[PDB]
């Protein structure tokens, strides 16, 4: 269960463009992504939502290299 | 024969030519100071209990 | 003007094209104040043919399974005889339709 580059690359750009619009809740983050992105599969959308909500959990305690938002 | 009872506290890798044999460190559960190394043939978990016929052979490594 | 309790049967290989045909036909009749009965769902009839891949018999033995599926979605209505002629117009390719007065 390792995520490939397409999921990870897409997750990086979403966080920096819309940082405040999505929060620690996985259910809410699922509905933010599909509104502001074009995904042709529900399963692909689910994986994208899973990674981005994990990233902000570790953002909450100290910044991480490779992430920059306004 | 003065048979002794021992208990497993930690498992240290799997030995043998074909992986059948496993190596464990046992505790005599009557004198907590002493501890030795033994060899076992079957599947072993922590807190398992083994019966030892002789307590002077030990094992390599 | 005598009602005859018509029944219409449909057949096609596609599934999306057939469904929207029935969706508009029920609306074409509902607005006309006609008592309409639901679009029943007849069983899909799947037929398959299996044959061996190689044409000569050498090497390993491997087979493949072709498939084909058909759906019906037949519909019936209570209406006079002349009105139904103008209600079944403008049909597209693929779907076959058969009309039965069922008098």
């Amino acid at each position: 269960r390792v995520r490939t580059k397409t999921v990870k690359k897409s997750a990086k750009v979403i966080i920096e463009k819309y940082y405040p619009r999505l929060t620690l809740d996985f259910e809410t983050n699922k509905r933010v992504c599909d509104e502001i992105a074009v995904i042709s599969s529900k399963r692909l959308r689910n994986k994208i939502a899973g990674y981005t909500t994990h990233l902000m959990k570790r953002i909450q305690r100290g910044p991480v290299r490779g992430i920059s938002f306004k | 024969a003065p048979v002794k009872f021992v208990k497993v506290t930690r498992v240290l890798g799997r030995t043998g030519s074909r992986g059948g044999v496993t190596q464990v460190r046992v505790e005599f559960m009557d004198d907590t100071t002493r501890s030795i190394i033994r060899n076992v043939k079957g599947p072993v978990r922590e807190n398992d209990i083994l019966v030892l016929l002789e307590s002077e052979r030990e094992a390599r490594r | 003007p005598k009602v005859h309790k018509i029944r219409i049967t449909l057949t096609s290989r596609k599934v999306q094209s057939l469904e929207k045909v029935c969706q508009e036909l029920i609306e074409r009749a509902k607005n006309k104040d006609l008592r309409v009965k639901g679009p029943v769902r007849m069983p899909t009839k799947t037929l398959k043919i299996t044959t061996r891949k190689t044409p000569c018999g050498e090497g390993s033995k491997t087979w493949d399974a072709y498939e084909m599926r058909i759906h019906k979605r037949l519909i019936d209505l209570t209406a006079p005889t002349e009105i139904v002629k103008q209600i079944i117009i403008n049909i597209e390719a693929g779907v076959e339709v058969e009309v039965t007065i069922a008098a």
Binding site: - | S17, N39, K41, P43, L52 | -
Partner: protein, 199 residues
């Protein structure tokens, strides 16, 4: 009313088998508990469990279930579990009349006694055997004990006027004590004897 009068006899008392209760369990040794499961009673052995998914999930299973499955082997008896249950039930009746003790009293001590405590392992020696006489884990000991008991009954009843109901039954009473004239005991002591030589 809705139930037969037979089952009304046991409903007042504690739940148990058709005749016998799983109370008053032996106090004889250690290291064999936690792998023979009697805390949860079962009416009939038959059950569609999930015991073949993990490593030790089958360790938490009634012993009668373990015994019943091993009784059906050798090609002809595949999937005929209903026939096996009939044989098992009758065998518990035979041992009860020949010994006032509980049938589970016979079954438990029989299994715990016919399990080898040492065995020789195969380490390559370029055509020879450097049998190191390793120890045996408790889980394998109970697994092999069930196989030894059942294979003895299948051997005896083959082409014999006797029936499997008591051929299996007579082994259990023999294996309850040090009878030494049973099939299981003959193989168990033989395996331990050769292991001692290769120490």
């Amino acid at each position: 009313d809705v139930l037969p009068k037979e089952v009304l006899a046991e409903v007042g008392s504690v739940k148990l088998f058709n005749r016998w209760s799983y109370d008053d369990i032996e106090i004889r040794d250690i290291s064999l508990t936690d792998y023979i499961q009697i805390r949860a009673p079962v009416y009939i052995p038959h059950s569609a469990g999930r015991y073949a998914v993990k490593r030790f999930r089958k360790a938490n299973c009634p012993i009668i279930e373990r015994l019943t499955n091993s009784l059906m082997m050798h090609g002809r008896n595949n999937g005929k579990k209903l026939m096996a249950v009939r044989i098992v039930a009758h065998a518990f009746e035979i041992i009860h009349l020949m010994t006032d003790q509980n049938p589970i009293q016979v079954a438990v001590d029989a299994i715990v006694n016919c399990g080898p405590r040492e065995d020789s392992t195969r380490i390559g020696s370029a055509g020879t055997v450097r049998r190191q006489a390793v120890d045996v884990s408790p889980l394998r000991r109970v697994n092999q004990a069930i196989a030894l008991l059942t294979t003895g009954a299948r051997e005896a009843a083959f082409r014999n006027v006797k029936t499997i109901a008591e051929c299996l039954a007579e082994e259990l009473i023999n294996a309850a004590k040090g009878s030494s004239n049973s099939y299981a005991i003959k193989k168990k002591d033989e395996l331990e004897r050769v292991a001692k030589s290769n120490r």
